[PDB]
Enzyme design. Structure first.
Site, PDB file in Angstrom:
ATOM      1  N   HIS A 224       0.797  -1.240   0.000  1.00 52.03           N
ATOM      2  CA  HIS A 224       0.000   0.000   0.000  1.00 52.03           C
ATOM      3  C   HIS A 224       0.824   1.281   0.000  1.00 52.03           C
ATOM      4  O   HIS A 224       0.357   2.277  -0.489  1.00 52.03           O
ATOM      5  CB  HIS A 224      -1.033   0.052   1.154  1.00 52.03           C
ATOM      6  CG  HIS A 224      -0.407   0.048   2.507  1.00 52.03           C
ATOM      7  ND1 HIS A 224       0.060  -1.076   3.074  1.00 52.03           N
ATOM      8  CD2 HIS A 224      -0.099   1.097   3.385  1.00 52.03           C
ATOM      9  CE1 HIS A 224       0.625  -0.776   4.263  1.00 52.03           C
ATOM     10  NE2 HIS A 224       0.518   0.555   4.457  1.00 52.03           N
ATOM     11  N   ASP A 225       2.024   1.259   0.554  1.00 51.50           N
ATOM     12  CA  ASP A 225       2.828   2.471   0.666  1.00 51.50           C
ATOM     13  C   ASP A 225       3.977   2.569  -0.352  1.00 51.50           C
ATOM     14  O   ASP A 225       4.917   3.370  -0.148  1.00 51.50           O
ATOM     15  CB  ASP A 225       3.476   2.541   2.038  1.00 51.50           C
ATOM     16  CG  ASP A 225       2.620   3.264   3.071  1.00 51.50           C
ATOM     17  OD1 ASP A 225       1.630   3.925   2.738  1.00 51.50           O
ATOM     18  OD2 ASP A 225       3.016   3.223   4.236  1.00 51.50           O
ATOM     19  N   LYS A 228       5.650   5.742  -1.813  1.00 53.86           N
ATOM     20  CA  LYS A 228       6.644   6.590  -1.142  1.00 53.86           C
ATOM     21  C   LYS A 228       7.955   6.697  -1.900  1.00 53.86           C
ATOM     22  O   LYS A 228       8.766   7.600  -1.624  1.00 53.86           O
ATOM     23  CB  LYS A 228       6.920   6.148   0.278  1.00 53.86           C
ATOM     24  CG  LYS A 228       5.720   6.439   1.183  1.00 53.86           C
ATOM     25  CD  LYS A 228       5.899   5.782   2.525  1.00 53.86           C
ATOM     26  CE  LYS A 228       4.779   6.214   3.467  1.00 53.86           C
ATOM     27  NZ  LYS A 228       5.094   5.679   4.821  1.00 53.86           N
ATOM     28  N   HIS A 253       1.590  10.076  -2.132  1.00 53.42           N
ATOM     29  CA  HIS A 253       2.073   8.687  -2.118  1.00 53.42           C
ATOM     30  C   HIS A 253       0.981   7.695  -2.462  1.00 53.42           C
ATOM     31  O   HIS A 253       1.264   6.624  -3.027  1.00 53.42           O
ATOM     32  CB  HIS A 253       2.763   8.301  -0.818  1.00 53.42           C
ATOM     33  CG  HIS A 253       1.804   7.921   0.319  1.00 53.42           C
ATOM     34  ND1 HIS A 253       1.216   8.850   1.122  1.00 53.42           N
ATOM     35  CD2 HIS A 253       1.398   6.673   0.809  1.00 53.42           C
ATOM     36  CE1 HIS A 253       0.456   8.233   2.050  1.00 53.42           C
ATOM     37  NE2 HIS A 253       0.569   6.906   1.865  1.00 53.42           N
ATOM     38  N   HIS A 279      -6.157   3.698   1.052  1.00 54.15           N
ATOM     39  CA  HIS A 279      -5.948   3.296   2.422  1.00 54.15           C
ATOM     40  C   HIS A 279      -5.948   4.435   3.449  1.00 54.15           C
ATOM     41  O   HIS A 279      -5.954   4.160   4.649  1.00 54.15           O
ATOM     42  CB  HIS A 279      -4.710   2.412   2.558  1.00 54.15           C
ATOM     43  CG  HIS A 279      -3.416   3.120   2.276  1.00 54.15           C
ATOM     44  ND1 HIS A 279      -3.024   3.448   1.018  1.00 54.15           N
ATOM     45  CD2 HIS A 279      -2.391   3.534   3.131  1.00 54.15           C
ATOM     46  CE1 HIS A 279      -1.817   4.054   1.073  1.00 54.15           C
ATOM     47  NE2 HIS A 279      -1.432   4.114   2.361  1.00 54.15           N
ATOM     48  N   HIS A 280      -5.915   5.690   2.985  1.00 51.24           N
ATOM     49  CA  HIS A 280      -6.050   6.874   3.851  1.00 51.24           C
ATOM     50  C   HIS A 280      -7.404   7.504   3.719  1.00 51.24           C
ATOM     51  O   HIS A 280      -7.657   8.543   4.324  1.00 51.24           O
ATOM     52  CB  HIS A 280      -4.951   7.925   3.585  1.00 51.24           C
ATOM     53  CG  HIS A 280      -3.584   7.464   4.006  1.00 51.24           C
ATOM     54  ND1 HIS A 280      -3.190   7.432   5.298  1.00 51.24           N
ATOM     55  CD2 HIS A 280      -2.528   6.959   3.260  1.00 51.24           C
ATOM     56  CE1 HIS A 280      -1.936   6.932   5.375  1.00 51.24           C
ATOM     57  NE2 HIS A 280      -1.536   6.642   4.124  1.00 51.24           N
ATOM     58  N   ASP A 308      -3.667  -1.462   9.017  1.00 52.27           N
ATOM     59  CA  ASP A 308      -2.500  -0.608   9.028  1.00 52.27           C
ATOM     60  C   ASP A 308      -2.524   0.252  10.315  1.00 52.27           C
ATOM     61  O   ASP A 308      -1.524   0.354  11.027  1.00 52.27           O
ATOM     62  CB  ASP A 308      -2.555   0.283   7.782  1.00 52.27           C
ATOM     63  CG  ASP A 308      -1.301   1.086   7.567  1.00 52.27           C
ATOM     64  OD1 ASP A 308      -0.181   0.523   7.697  1.00 52.27           O
ATOM     65  OD2 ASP A 308      -1.441   2.286   7.243  1.00 52.27           O
TER      66      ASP A 308
HETATM   67 FE   LIG Z   1       1.808   0.943   7.229  1.00 53.85          FE
HETATM   68 FE   LIG Z   2       2.039   3.946   6.130  1.00 54.58          FE
HETATM   69 FE   LIG Z   3       0.065   5.410   3.304  1.00 56.24          FE
END
Ligand SMILES: [Fe+3]
Ligand SMILES: [Fe+3]
Ligand SMILES: [Fe+3]
Ligand SMILES: [Fe+3]
Ligand SMILES: [Fe+3]
Ligand SMILES: [Fe+3]
Lengths: 363, 361
Positions: A224-225, A228, A253, A279-280, A308
């Site tokens: 998911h990240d 970045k 991101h 996811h945010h 998360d």
């Molecule tokens: Fe995480």
């Molecule tokens: Fe994260």
């Molecule tokens: Fe994230």
């Protein structure tokens, strides 16, 4: 009257069962049951060779441990070493036969037929053995022929199960390692990346999703990240809290992860891309990047948010000790229907012990 | 002697359990069914959600044949889920005799049953034709074909699962390898092509087919460590000085660190390629100056493939080199940058490399 096709139909049923079975243990069981019925023998065993311990091994019964066998001794050992077939008309007249198992249980071993198992490159990888022909005094030349066809099928099935598990493992490993390519510029740990998928797997499972989707969430959530990697160092490495300009970049991101992931055709990547971009988001509509609300967020993104946040709260982060179970529970109850999907939060809470258990043994 | 068909089944199921290609699984199953049902022909029709058609493949490995999912014998069985047992095709209104017309065939008896997935949905049709008695398929034949059909369902679902996994695994490796795309110009197709060149090279150098498949998937990841290079180096809008270049060189070590926490052979190889791909046969490369066979064969194959891809791509002012010019450069670099033995193998196969470059721009 008898069915002339009886054994054929029985064999087809075993073959269907075996083709569906990913667990090597049960494949071995089903092959053994198959041999008994087809060979009309009272007992059957498969011995496989362990590279490390330098032994053959077998599983005696359903659900019991690996029994190690001496490959330099006995009937199976002979067949394993030479690649030659042993057909013993009377076990008690063969010095290679050990009566101890017979002596303890009230069992009497009479006839033994053992053939090698061969891999695709004609290496000997084990032995298929049958014991006590039921419908004849001895195993015949025809029985030998039949057991050799069974051996070939057993070999193929065994190798296939192993190759598949090797692939499955490599696929997980690759996802986990590549997901942690951020390790030089971000403090999130390798175990964090793994655990998030593991918590989401429980959630999908207890939420009643198909077994395929459960497996996909486990592998998709860890990515998911990844976005970045495209965030500037001045933002990602900033040793404190961000300005509006910087925070606005940091939020991207999600968009970036989506760009990295969306070019797939596989369901895995379509779900991973959605997770990256979602996811945010909050059940609220107050998250980022789009302020999506409720069912506007795919179930996969909703499950990953919970997993998360859970894992972050239960780790030490500079200035803040990892929360314990009780506080984490109070937090999730308060954020039900706010940050998080209220139905999935209840499932998560109900399975909170499995969550902490994963957290404890994968540090 | 009634063990005849048992040995036949066991032969086919051994081949089926090894088979990684859906097409071949289907061919085996239809050959299995011909032998076991003692019938002259068999076909499996599968449904395509997308095109809303059934399809089937014929032997020799030709294209998928689109089949009308509504009309026809297969169409009828797919829609209704009912078994169809026809004693004479030429008396049945649902039969299309045009297949016979083009092939020189005369279809007499047709038995067609549904295939079901685990979830219990109808996913296709198993059809057997021309029982070799020249008479009807019997109730006992229907019953046998129901068992064959369940075995076909299971092996087909299994082969599809296996293909999904393989495709997802490649997709993941290709997409994540290109995670460098915001900060580095190496393209998605370049990343794919370099594994494809190394796959041909490995095969032609005689590695086991498992190792060949591993190089195809491992080589693409070799530059992932660029993700760890500081922006003031990687995005510097001017030539790098020596100090910055030393940092840039660490992308090899960084890639190794990302990849090496594996247990799988794929990651063990990928980590070696990440750290080795700038090493030079004569020991004049970086980061360590490894020499000859101190460099794993996988690293040596990737260096050749990666340079090849770069020489054969255009840049401003710098036209791609053609075959003749590229061949000359590789001969010059034999024993310098590159493994002399692998270079020879690569040169014998350079037309295959150019074909990949042309097919995936
Ligand atoms: Fe995480
Ligand atoms: Fe994260
Ligand atoms: Fe994230
Ligand atoms: Fe590069
Ligand atoms: Fe490089
Ligand atoms: Fe490259």
């Amino acid at each position: 009257y008898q069915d002339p096709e009886r054994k054929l139909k029985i064999l087809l049923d075993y073959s269907s069962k075996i083709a569906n079975e990913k667990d090597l243990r049960n494949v071995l069981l089903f092959l053994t049951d198959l041999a008994k019925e087809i060979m009309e023998a009272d007992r059957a065993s498969i011995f496989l060779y362990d590279d490390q311990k330098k032994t053959l091994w077998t599983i005696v019964a359903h659900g019991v441990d690996r029994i190690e066998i001496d490959a330099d001794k006995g009937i199976a050992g002979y067949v394993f070493r030479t690649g030659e077939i042993l057909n013993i008309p009377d076990a008690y007249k063969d010095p290679r036969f050990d009566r101890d198992i017979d002596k303890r249980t009230g069992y009497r071993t009479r006839t033994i037929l053992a053939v090698p198992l061969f891999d695709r490159k004609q290496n000997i990888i084990g032995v298929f053995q049958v014991i006590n022909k039921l419908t004849n005094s001895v195993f015949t030349e025809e029985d030998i022929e039949l057991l050799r066809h069974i051996s070939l099928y057993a070999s193929s099935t065994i190798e296939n199960a192993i190759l598949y598990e090797k692939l499955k493992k490599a696929h997980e490993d690759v996802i986990y390692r590549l997901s942690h390519a951020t390790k030089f510029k971000d403090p999130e740990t390798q175990n964090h990346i793994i655990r998030v998928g593991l918590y989401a797997e429980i959630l999908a499972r207890e939420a009643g999703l198909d077994e395929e989707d459960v497996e996909l969430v486990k592998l998709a959530a860890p990515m998911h990240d990844i976005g970045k990697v495209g965030i500037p160092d001045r933002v990602l490495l900033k040793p404190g809290k961000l300005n509006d300009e910087e925070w606005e970049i940091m939020k991207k991101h999600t968009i970036y992860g989506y760009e990295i992931l969306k070019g797939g055709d596989s369901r895995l990547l379509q779900i991973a891309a959605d997770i990256a971009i979602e996811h945010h988001e909050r059940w609220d509509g107050t998250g980022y990047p789009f302020g999506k609300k409720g069912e506007e967020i795919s179930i996969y993104g909703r499950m990953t948010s919970i997993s998360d946040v859970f894992d972050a709260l239960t780790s030490d982060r500079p200035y803040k000790k990892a929360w314990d179970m009780d506080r984490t529970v109070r937090f999730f109850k308060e954020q039900k229907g706010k940050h998080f999907d209220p139905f999935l939060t209840d499932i998560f809470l109900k399975n909170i012990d499995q969550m902490f258990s994963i957290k404890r043994e994968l540090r």
